Design a binder for this molecule. Structure first.
Ligand code: A1CET
Ligand code: FE
Ligand code: NA
Ligand code: NA
Ligand code: NA
Ligand code: NA
Ligand code: NA
Length: 45
């Protein structure tokens, strides 16, 4: 399962912690729960 990390605050998106929803399937209006940036500010781990 592909993890992503927020460029700005280091928050880690692990799909297993979000009912197995892959990062790429998140809505375009999702944002980092810590700092509020869009999905554009994430990088794959
Ligand atoms: C995460 C951080 C800040 C947000 C978020 C999410 O908004 C999610 C819902 O967005 C709906 C589309 O945008 C509505 C208005 O956007 C401009 C102001 O948004 C406030 C911050 O929203
Ligand atoms: Fe963040
Ligand atoms: Na991968
Ligand atoms: Na974790
Ligand atoms: Na938060
Ligand atoms: Na926005
Ligand atoms: Na990477």
């Amino acid at each position: 399962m592909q993890k992503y990390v927020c460029n700005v605050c280091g928050y880690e998106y692990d799909p297993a912690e979000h009912d197995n929803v892959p990062f790429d399937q998140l809505p375009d209006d999702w944002c980092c729960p810590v700092c509020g940036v869009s999905k554009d500010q994430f990088s794959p781990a």
